[PDB]
Amino acid sequence: SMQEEDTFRELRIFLRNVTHRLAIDKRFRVFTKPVDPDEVPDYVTVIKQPMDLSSVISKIDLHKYLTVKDYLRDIDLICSNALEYNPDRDPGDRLIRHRACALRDTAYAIIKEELDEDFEQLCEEIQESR
């Protein structure tokens, strides 16, 4: 219905705002664009599903997220990819892992504070009905 399309449009608006707030945070700069193959050529061979915040914005706009849970799966993938690819003890790896965990935790905390659980539930029920 038009009511349902309005619900998904509101979801997109909400997700874009959250993603923008993550993307402008200087700690998360490394997650704002895909990893550069020129710089890291083995990335695309090791990490099977690359994800970054620009790709997340693209996916919102393509209506790929019908629930906050679908969205958080991609935030989680940004984080898990960084933990997997940078697992070492050295400071460079430890810094990126800390930032990756912060990205994930920040996204979850924004959603916890600002998403009404009944709004998420409605999205889930519309999605499940399709």
Ligand X SMILES: COC(=O)c1cc(N)cc(-c2c(C)noc2C)c1
Coil, strand or helix: which one is 54?
helix
For residues 100-129, which are near ligand X according to CB under 6 A?
A: none
Residue (76 or 120) nearer to ligand X, CB: 76
Residue (82 or 111) nearer to ligand X, CB: 82
33 binds ligand X (CB under 6 A): yes
Secondary element (H or E) of residue 16: helix 2-23
From the list 127, 129, 123, 130, the residue with the least C-alpha distance to 13 is 123
Query: How many residues are listed for the chain in this entry?
Result: 130
For residues 1-30, which are near ligand X according to CB under 6 A?
A: 30
Residue 77 tokens, joined: 């993938």
For residues 63-92, which are near ligand X according to CB under 6 A?
A: 82, 85-86
Site of interaction with ligand X (CB under 6 A): 30-31, 33, 35-36, 40, 82, 85-86, 96
